[PDB]
Amino acid sequence: IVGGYTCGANTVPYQVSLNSGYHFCGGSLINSQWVVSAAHCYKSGIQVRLGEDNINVVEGNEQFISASKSIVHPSYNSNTLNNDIMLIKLKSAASLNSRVASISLPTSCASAGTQCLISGWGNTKSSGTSYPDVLKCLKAPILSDSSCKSAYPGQITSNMFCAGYLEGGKDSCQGDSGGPVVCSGKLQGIVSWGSGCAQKNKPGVYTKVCNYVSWIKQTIASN
Numbered sequence: 508i509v510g511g512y513t514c515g516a517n518t519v520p521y522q523v524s525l526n527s528g529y530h531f532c533g534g535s536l537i538n539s540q541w542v543v544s545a546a547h548c549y550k551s552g553i554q555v556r557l558g559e560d561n562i563n564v565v566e567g568n569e570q571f572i573s574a575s576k577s578i579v580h581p582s583y584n585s586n587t588l589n590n591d592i593m594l595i596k597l598k599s600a601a602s603l604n605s606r607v608a609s610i611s612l613p614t615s616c617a618s619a620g621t622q623c624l625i626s627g628w629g630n631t632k633s634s635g636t637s638y639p640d641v642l643k644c645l646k647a648p649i650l651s652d653s654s655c656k657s658a659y660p661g662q663i664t665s666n667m668f669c670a671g672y673l674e675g676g677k678d679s680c681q682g683d684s685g686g687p688v689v690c691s692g693k694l695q696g697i698v699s700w701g702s703g704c705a706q707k708n709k710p711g712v713y714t715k716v717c718n719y720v721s722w723i724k725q726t727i728a729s730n
């Protein structure tokens with residue numbers, strides 16, 4: 508997160524850390540056994556870490572559950588990042604509590620101007636490298652499709668939306684990818700890509716979650 512604030516331990520209970528010997532992407536707990544993340548976070552050997560604040564210290568409240576399968580969306584395209592969505596099945600169910608909870612899927616897409624919360628343990632530096640220990644947060648509005656497109660001509664599909672600030676100085680960045688964009692309580696976006704981090708006129712681009720509700724439900728119901 509570039510330009511965000513420390514969230515406060517356990518205040519974003521659906522936030523997960525994808526780990527393979529170090530934190531590499533986030534995700535969101537959408538139920539006791541399934542996490543949604545980005546298809547580009549895919550790798551084998553993933554341990555899902557729930558209930559984390561400081562990712563370098565065991566402080567209590569943590570649940571380390573391995574991934575039992577990851578399902579990249581079948582039309583995910585790595586050159587464009589269209590369909591940049593993946594579902595992870597946990598090997599056992601998580602203990603949901605006040606520090607580990609799931610986030611609702613949307614029933615409709617969010618409109619421009621909606622304010623959302625992006626969270627992640629990604630880089631905090633726009634020009635440079637600085638990973639945080641604790642979770643960072645950033646409030647950011649969904650931008651109009653007009654503006655999203657005029658910033659990334661020819662690269663925005665109908666499965667993406669831009670959110671953030673055109674001025675620069677506030678955006679998601681490397682290591683935030685996979686994590687959530689929550690709006691009025693629902694999961695509307697997945698941290699997917701952008702040009703640089705926090706650069707003016709180059710907002711963050713997000714997987715459009717509402718277009719995937721039926722796929723998720725169907726996929727989960729048969730796995």
Ligand SMILES: *C(=O)c1ccc(NC(=N)N)cc1
Binds near residue numbers: 684704
């Ligand atoms: C994911 O790690 C990721 C997503 C988005 C960006 N760029 C911007 N938000 N500008 C970087 C890395």
Ligand SMILES: [Ca+2]
Binds near residue numbers: 561562563
């Ligand atoms: Ca920890």
